[PDB]
RNA sequence: GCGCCAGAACU
RNA sequence: GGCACCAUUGCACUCCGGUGCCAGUUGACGAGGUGGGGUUUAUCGAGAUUUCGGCGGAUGACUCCCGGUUGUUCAUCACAACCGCAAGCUUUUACUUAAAUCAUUAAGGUGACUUAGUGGACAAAGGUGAAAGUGUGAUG
């Protein structure tokens, strides 16, 4: 269902761990205020980020508004987080 | 036990 | 550590895919040490994944010299050890800031690491102060 994480996937490999966070910040800033944005450039975790959120509201405005949305020559693919995250269940 | 850095080791 | 190529479309919350090329970083912690030449593997502990390995230096050692000193009064010689502004040797102590490692804390770096601090200390050789026993022979 919803939750105060949400999962990117499809996003440009080619870029550096804390670029990527720098320029996901740029945007995901207008819908709420961001906790955490969690980048790992391993094989099973690359193309992926994890913004997280403090509202589950700033949550679904970001899914709705950047779905499909051009970001480094790639379209983003945004889902909500399957579980919560260790800031937000702990 | 003083200086340097084509190996080696580490990132 | 970058960079390139290949593989990868995953649901994480401590650093974790291959392969090449190209960089970077470490790389001796203090104590002590120089009459001239020759020869050489250059003293002492502390620490210990590299204080490894390679290059350069080097006050060491050995040996032949030059010049001294001691050899328990003096001098000339040979002989033994010794000094090189010091000086026979065995034998005891104390003193001569040990520093780094270790433990931490800050600053810088993506990182390996770098710089600077702080804490606790811990030597040996040499040298010196003082305490014990002995130094070669022949001689004008
Ligand atoms: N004091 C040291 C010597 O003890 C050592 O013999 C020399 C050579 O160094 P290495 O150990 O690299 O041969 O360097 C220094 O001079
Ligand atoms: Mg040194």
Redesign the pocket.
Same mark, same amino acid.
């Given at each position: 269902r919803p939750?105060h994480?949400i999962?990117?996937?499809? +996003?440009?490999?080619?870029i550096?761990?804390?670029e990527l966070k720098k320029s996901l910040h740029a945007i995901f800033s207008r819908f709420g205020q961001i906790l955490?944005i +969690?980048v790992?450039?391993? +094989?099973?975790?690359?193309?992926?980020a994890?913004v997280?959120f403090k509202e589950v509201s700033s949550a679904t405005n970001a899914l709705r508004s950047m779905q499909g949305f051009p970001f480094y020559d790639?379209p983003m693919?945004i889902?909500?987080?399957?579980?919560?995250?260790?800031?937000?269940?702990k």
């Open positions: 939750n994480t999962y990117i996937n499809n +996003l440009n490999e080619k550096k761990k804390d955490d +969690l790992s450039r391993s +094989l099973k975790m690359r193309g992926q994890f997280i790639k693919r889902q909500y987080a399957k579980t919560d995250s260790d800031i937000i269940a």
